[PDB]
Amino acid sequence: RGTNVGRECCLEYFKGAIPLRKLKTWYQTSEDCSRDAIVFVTVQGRAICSDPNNKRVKNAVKYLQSL
Amino acid sequence: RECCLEYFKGAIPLRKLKTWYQTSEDCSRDAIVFVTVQGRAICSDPNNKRVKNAVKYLQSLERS
Numbered sequence: 001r002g003t004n005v006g007r008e009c010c011l012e013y014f015k016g017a018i019p020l021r022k023l024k025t026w027y028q029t030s031e032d033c034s035r036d037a038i039v040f041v042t043v044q045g046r047a048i049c050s051d052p053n054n055k056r057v058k059n060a061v062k063y064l065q066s067l
Numbered sequence: 068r069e070c071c072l073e074y075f076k077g078a079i080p081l082r083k084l085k086t087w088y089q090t091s092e093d094c095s096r097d098a099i100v101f102v103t104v105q106g107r108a109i110c111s112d113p114n115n116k117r118v119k120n121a122v123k124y125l126q127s128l129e130r131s
Binding site: 010045046047 | 068069070071072073074075076085086087088089090094098100102106107108109110111
């Protein structure tokens with residue numbers, strides 16, 4: 001509701017190859033967080049903080065959206 | 068490398084929930100993170116009974 005209550009922010013980005021087959025969904029974190037971030041959630045329930053400006057991140061979002 | 072700034076307070080209707088995950092590294096607060104149908108995340112108290120019930124709903128929805 002525009003507040004920190006219940007807010008998740010990405011302190012730092014995951015570095016490394018996005019495991020494309022393991023991705024289940026994604027969301028974009030609050031615009032009020034310091035970092036702009038896309039969080040991927042894997043099928044096994046891992047979370048991956050990612051930079052929305054990155055080519056490979058944008059490709060992984062497009063993939064998920066295509067399904 | 069994600070942080071829950073503070074746990075959510077209040078009810079989240081089950082129909083608004085899409086999925087969940089839990090991280091346990093420092094600053095996570097070991098929070099249960101609910102991803103809503105509207106595409107937001109609500110990080111929540113893992114010891115709260117309502118939070119537990121929502122995760123149980125989501126798990127049961129998956130496996131049927």
